Amino acid sequence: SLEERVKEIIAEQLGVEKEKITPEAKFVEDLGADSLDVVELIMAFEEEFGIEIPDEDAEKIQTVGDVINYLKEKV
Ligand code: NA
Ligand SMILES: [Zn+2]
Ligand SMILES: [Zn+2]
Ligand SMILES: [Zn+2]
Ligand SMILES: [Zn+2]
Ligand SMILES: [Zn+2]
Ligand SMILES: [Zn+2]
Ligand SMILES: [Zn+2]
Numbered sequence: 001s002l003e004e005r006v007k008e009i010i011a012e013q014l015g016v017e018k019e020k021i022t023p024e025a026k027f028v029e030d031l032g033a034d035s036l037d038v039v040e041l042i043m044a045f046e047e048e049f050g051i052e053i054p055d056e057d058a059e060k061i062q063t064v065g066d067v068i069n070y071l072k073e074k075v
Contacts, residue, residue: 002068002071002072002075003068005048005049006021006045006064006067006068006071007021009041009044009045009048010027010031010041010064012044013033013037013040013041013044014027014031014032014033014037014041016031016032021064022064023063023064023065023068024063024064024065025063025064025065026062026063027041027061027062027063027064028062031064041061042058042061045061045067045071049071049075050075051071051074051075053070057070
């Protein structure tokens with residue numbers, strides 16, 4: 001599912017257990033993502049879902065929920 005794929009992307013990049021990858025979890029504050037991690041997460045979401053996340057939209061991707069909601073509507 002879309003959610004499962006999003007979890008694997010995040011788990012692979014941040015090394016966090018999927019059980020902690022919840023909708024309200026902030027990549028930085030809750031999942032420990034640093035600046036490079038965030039850039040790589042965006043790059044991965046684009047590659048895996050075949051879409052583009054313009055800089056503007058990328059800035060709004062702060063939680064797991066943002067990515068899921070964004071992708072569900074866009075793809
Ligand atoms: Na993986
Ligand atoms: Zn891989
Ligand atoms: Zn697990
Ligand atoms: Zn923040
Ligand atoms: Zn928090
Ligand atoms: Zn891009
Ligand atoms: Zn947009
Ligand atoms: Zn948000």
